[PDB]
From Swiss-Prot, chains A, B:
Documented EC number(s): 3.5.2.3
Species name: Saccharomyces cerevisiae (strain ATCC 204508 / S288c)
InterPro entries: Amidohydro-rel (IPR006680), DHOdimr (IPR004721), Dihydroorotase_CS (IPR002195), Metal_Hydrolase (IPR032466)
Residues making up the signal peptide according to the UniProt record: none
Record PROSITE patterns: DIHYDROOROTASE_1, DIHYDROOROTASE_2
Residues the record lists as N6-carboxylysine modifications: K97
Catalytic activity annotation: (S)-dihydroorotate + H2O = N-carbamoyl-L-aspartate + H(+)
Protein known as: Dihydroorotase
Cofactor(s) required, per the database record: Zn(2+)
Length: 364, 364
């Protein structure tokens, strides 16, 4: 069967929770074909302290010794520039993640984004320390006057001026618009990068999830298992995301936003938790998309080369040098991912067939 | 005001199901402030025979002797013009409801709205007998990859040409665009009624629900209790819907589309049943909107006059002459509506407070 050497794969947007959920999902990073994971910090309470983020990573490394973990802080008024310099000097974080208040799980108390001024001391310190600023780029919803109303469909577009102003005010800060979902955002990222030759000049990039390469509004209208933030939008948005994924441009790379929830948190009649679980088959999901687009030769850049370059992942921090190999053996997504105890998760595209599987190969 | 005499109130879009659900629901039409109800036919199996529609009405009258019941057929493969004539002269039906196949609850036996042609004989017989053609005006979803995508957000607008074509081909047939949700549909209805100024001139009307005058997409995205068909759309759409409701225009009147589902059919991780249950407080929901718009003076037309006129309801058909009196005692909506056995419903805006109650006064 056909095979594709993908090398050291990167998922630069991972949720792994705590407790028994973390013990279930953290080994699945490797199982899904991912060597390097960027760990998001929206725990309860958020990660805003150095000892917390040190312990968390060590807990993850214990659960999965072959996986390379890049950590983050949650953007909070609790952060100080001193805490940034210290954490960055100790290699305890690689970036800081911004959640606008109220917009997704564990996002209030995050921040309001027609502002960001109050966090300029933090960004300054991050810029100095070469830390990445990650953005859940959605403006909070507003329906009354005066302005044009903000809702789950235009909230990403409405965020794009904040993105531009941040890039303007901090031209040397690395910034990521996480999990892009709209055509408008894709074009904004390309227009920000119009003068870029060679990958190493990219200062603003965007990540793309597996599930937004498949879903539109119709897939989650009536199916909480497909409901996430930002919400999957219109077919034209989906087309633009897939084109960007297969484009070979260095400012689009893979981040799953795999966000696990126990099934009973998805089958609520009110307050469904947002989040789609894709960790267990992360790279096969993507392979499905690159195959259907006749773009397999661009797979390696999207799930490996470009994320490593943007984050400057050194071989010396890599926990395992095994390479992820895709091999074209068909498989069936299970109905549930379970720990055999109190946790069942519905995986993305549960029940469906995937053309590809992943295995691991020693280097040299 | 305090106390408004709404007369013989009209809800021209009602679902009461069968069995224990029906026993719980059909008394609440009255309790909700409604005198005249138009009963939709999407039972299992669909209501498509004379004996069934007669026995159904008989069951409903026993459960609520003072409610006026206007009945309907389900637009079916099995219907014939002979049955339309026979059921019309026996006054067993007042209209026929069209469901497009698969767009909503119990629509799997519905039609293909791209080709209505095989139902033109049914529509010619309805036109003779002065029966009403109700339309759930949405096209089924088409993702396709060639012709225009149809999805839950443009599926109503995509249906508008079909509506104009049926109006053109049957100019004397009373037709209703049920539960309008978009500004485009408001404009097409206002359009078709360019040169009608009161009231009996109207041939093509549209009903507006309680929930669509409150809801936007933000309210049902993570809340299945607010999920219904057609889906609630953008703030710009709800603004057109609300302005159309308090408009005093005779081509807009109240139809609740109260659609009860047991709470287990809403707390699903997939296949959430579509439907908002608003029967228990229908008139007070509407009152709140007209109050906030400073337009109580048009409440009587929206909730009584225009529906009685368009359906040509006669005093001789009315099961009780009691008048719906709207009085301003605050009430708090329950968290649950229950029969005390197996059935529980989450009502619309559960836990919220309404400014108005409604009671029944006789005519003397
Ligand atoms: Zn996010
Ligand atoms: Zn995330
Ligand atoms: Zn309907
Ligand atoms: Zn209905």
């Amino acid at each position: 069967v056909q095979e594709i050497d993908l090398g050291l794969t990167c998922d630069m947007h991972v949720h792994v929770r705590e407790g028994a959920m973390c013990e279930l999902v953290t080994p699945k990073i490797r199982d899904g074909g991912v060597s390097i994971a960027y760990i998001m910090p929206n725990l309860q309470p958020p990660i805003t302290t150095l000892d917390r983020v040190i312990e968390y990573k060590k807990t993850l490394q214990k659960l999965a010794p072959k996986t390379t973990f890049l950590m983050s802080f949650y953007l909070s008024k609790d952060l100080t520039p001193d805490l940034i310099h210290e954490a960055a000097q100790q290699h305890a974080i690689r970036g800081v993640k911004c959640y606008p208040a109220g917009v997704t799980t564990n996002s209030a108390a995050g921040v309001d984004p027609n502002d960001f001024s109050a966090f300029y001391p933090i960004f300054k310190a991050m810029q100095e320390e070469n830390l990445v600023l990650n953005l859940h780029g959605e403006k909070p919803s507003v329906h009354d006057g005066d302005k044009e109303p903000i809702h789950v469909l235009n909230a990403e577009e409405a965020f794009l001026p904040a993105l531009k102003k941040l890039h303007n005010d901090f031209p040397n800060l690395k910034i990521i618009l996480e999990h892009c979902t709209s055509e408008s955002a894709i074009k904004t990222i390309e227009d920000i990068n119009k003068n870029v030759k060679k990958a190493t000049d990219v200062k603003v990039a965007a990540t793309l999830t597996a599930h937004h390469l498949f879903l539109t509004i119709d897939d989650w209208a009536g199916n909480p298992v497909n409901f996430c933030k930002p919400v999957a939008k219109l077919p034209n948005d989906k087309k633009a995301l897939v084109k960007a994924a297969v484009s070979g441009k260095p400012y689009f790379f893979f981040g799953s936003d795999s966000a696990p929830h126990p099934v009973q948190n998805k089958a609520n009649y009110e307050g469904v938790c947002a989040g789609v679980y894709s960790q267990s088959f992360a790279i096969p999901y993507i392979a499905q998309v690159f195959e259907e687009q006749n773009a397999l030769e661009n797979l390696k850049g999207f799930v490996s080369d470009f994320g490593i370059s943007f984050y400057e992942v050194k071989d010396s921090e890599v926990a395992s040098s095994d390479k992820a190999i895709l091999f074209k053996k068909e498989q069936v997504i299970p109905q549930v991912i379970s720990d055999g105890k109190d946790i069942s998760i519905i995986p993305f595209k549960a029940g469906d067939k995937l053309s590809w599987s992943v295995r691991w190969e020693p280097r040299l």
